[PDB]
Amino acid sequence: YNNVTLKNLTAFQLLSQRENICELLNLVESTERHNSIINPERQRMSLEEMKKMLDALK
Amino acid sequence: TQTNPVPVTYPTDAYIPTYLPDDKVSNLADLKKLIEMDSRLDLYLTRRRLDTSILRCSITIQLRGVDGGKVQYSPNLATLIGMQTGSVNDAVYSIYKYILINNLFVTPELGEVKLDSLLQKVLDTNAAHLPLMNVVQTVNKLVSPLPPIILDYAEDTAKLREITKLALQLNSSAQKYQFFHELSLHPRETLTHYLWSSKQNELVLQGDQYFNEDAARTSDIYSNNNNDRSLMGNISLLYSQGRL
Amino acid sequence: REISEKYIEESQAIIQELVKLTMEKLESKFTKLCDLETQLEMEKLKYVKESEKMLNDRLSLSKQILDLNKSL
Amino acid sequence: EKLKYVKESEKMLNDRLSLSKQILDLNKSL
Secondary structure, three states, X not given: OOOOOHHHHHHHHHHHHHHHHHHHOOXXXXXXXXXXXXXXXXXXXXXXXXXXXXXXXX | OOOOOOOOOOXXXXXXXXXXXXXXXXXXXXHHHHHHHHHHHHHHHXXXXXXXXXXXXXXXEOOOOOOOOOOEEOHHHHHHHOOOOOOOHHHHHHHHHHHHHHOOOOOOOOOOEEOOHHHHHHHOOOOOEEOHHHHHHOOOOOEEOOOOEEEEOOHHHXXXXXXXXXXXXXXXXXXXXXXXXXXXXXXXXXXXXXXXXXXXXXXXXXXXXOOOHHHHHOXXXXXXXXXXXXXXXXXXXXXXXXXX | OHHHHHHHHHHXXXXXXXXXXXXXXXXXXXXXXXXXXXXXXXXXXXXHHHHHHHHHHHHHHHHHHHHXXXXX | OOOHHHXXXXXXXXXXXXXXXXXXXXXXXX
């Protein structure tokens, strides 16, 4: 798994090529992979950690 | 460390996209300001880390403080230097500066020194020319130790890896933007490209299936597979080279 | 989108305020330190240039002792 | 180290003064 094969590279490309076309028709959801990387409660926690670092450094 | 960098299996400092429309992000250049800020801070720190160092019996007792910090001198080496018992590295440097003051090398021309009276006295040599390698070698001989008492009668790697892992997640969403963007730019010549390349990648992944254990031990490879045509046509070629 | 948009709009102001404030405090620590470095190198040169003359005094004094050992 | 080298320099300069006193012993030994 540390190496890649010619089988591994084509399977990585074809699975990634088929999922973007699976979004235009929207027969896949892909909502778990969106909001977990958005994570808007972390994004404000990122903001609140940025907000306190204004307050601590002033 | 080595003379070459150490290869690692986790990624090290992945790139940041620049084709991203920065009117929407407006933070790539400000994050770029942080990286050159950190590297200049890393430049000053690594420079500072480099620059912070740039019958009657006798009493014989082997003491606790037998140390080579103040090491004894031979009396010839003592009077050429001047000090009584300083150190061994100061003995080498004061000897080397004494030859450099007297200008004995040349006016090997630099290896051979002009042996003066004191230099012939401290080395017990009598040549006119002698290399400096053998001069400093006897300084390892001319120095004796001190005599005892005689009485007679991290987290930053995982932080970098997490930042390397999170930058890989940034490279995914930027590429996922631009494909649909260039599909919004051209829906024609990326779907015709898709319908060819996904067909081509379907061909490549389906190139390895007739090489299993019980797929070759049976005879549904050789017999009647002229529709296959792939093997059993090389027997006119492999026998012609003796491969059998 | 709206919870994402709320903390995507206020954040960039807090981003570029902090990074610019980081530029202030870091460069202030630089100009303090790069001028404290120059005051070292003077005393590093001044301690050497006297001890170099001290060692030249010590080697010339041993050569003056040679005159005091030939007259005995 | 800004304090250390001045602590070492003036000690060497005072050692130059006591060595200068040893020169005065060379001015009265003969």
